Amino acid sequence: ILPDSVDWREKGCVTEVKYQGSCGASWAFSAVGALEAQLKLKTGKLVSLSAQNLVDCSTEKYGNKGCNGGFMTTAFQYIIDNKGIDSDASYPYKAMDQKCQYDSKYRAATCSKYTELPYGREDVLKEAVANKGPVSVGVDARHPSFFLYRSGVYYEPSCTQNVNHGVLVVGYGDLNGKEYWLVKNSWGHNFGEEGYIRMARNKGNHCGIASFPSYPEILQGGG
Numbered sequence: 001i002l003p004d005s006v007d008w009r010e011k012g013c014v015t016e017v018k019y020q021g022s023c024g025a026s027w028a029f030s031a032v033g034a035l036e037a038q039l040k041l042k043t044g045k046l047v048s049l050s051a052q053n054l055v056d057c058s059t060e061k062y063g064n065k066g067c068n069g070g071f072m073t074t075a076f077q078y079i080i081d082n083k084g085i086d087s088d089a090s091y092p093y094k095a096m097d098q099k100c101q102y103d104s105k106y107r108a109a110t111c112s113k114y115t116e117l118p119y120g121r122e123d124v125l126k127e128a129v130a131n132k133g134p135v136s137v138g139v140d141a142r143h144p145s146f147f148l149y150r151s152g153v154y155y156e157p158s159c160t161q162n163v164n165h166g167v168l169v170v171g172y173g174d175l176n177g178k179e180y181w182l183v184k185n186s187w188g189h190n191f192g193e194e195g196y197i198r199m200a201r202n203k204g205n206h207c208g209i210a211s212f213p214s215y216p217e218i219l220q221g222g223g
């Protein structure tokens, strides 16, 4: 059976909330967040990964445009191809497009593979959050109510399943019966609940939370 509630912050799998600023690189933050959890699960160490490394290096060849958008799946593919990603400390975030400055000397994580989940399947997303860890997702975050979100379970009747902002699902639960997905955003700690947004769960793919989910993996050999 799946636990009724999950919070990956309780297992020390979630780094501090980041502030993307005037750079449309939510995709890079969503991708690093998911891999940070895997790095902790596999080694026991929590280290922030370089979103800047994705912005500057996972570019045209990955269908990404740095500060003008991108995708978590192709960000994972770049990490696979590159044989690593630098730590955030070694390659810091500047909220702007720069020349690729990857340095294998400061590589903090690898990626073996990535898995995409079926569209709108909140049951499959719940299973992946429980058994695999934090899942990279897109959400419809265009509505004034998302921008004005302070606390509780976010429900927007005007929300669509067409995603426009990359976030990280780090858990799930319920607020006195109102089911939610625990979401890590990249708008700093002053957004919502210390940088988190709890979004309506099992409400017909509310805001397209389960439209395009993906998660990376770090494999330990094989048999």
Ligand SMILES: C[C@H]1COCCN1CCCn1nc(-c2ccc(Cl)c(C#Cc3ccc(Cl)c(CNCc4ccccc4)c3)c2)c2c1CCN(C(=O)C(N)=O)C2
Residues within 6 Å of the ligand: 024, 027, 062, 063, 069, 070, 071, 072, 073, 074, 137, 138, 139, 140, 141, 142, 161, 162, 163, 164, 165, 166, 167, 208, 211, 212
């Ligand atoms: C095209 C091929 C080739 O190349 C690599 C892989 N690829 C993607 C294939 C799968 N696939 N994956 C996503 C997907 C997954 C995750 C995210 Cl995050 C986004 C996004 C976005 C986005 C869209 C518009 C804007 Cl303007 C912005 C910028 N942010 C604006 C903003 C809004 C609200 C608050 C703040 C900022 C981001 C999109 C989508 C799709 C299919 C079409 N999509 C939709 O039908 C939808 N839409 O569901 C979106």
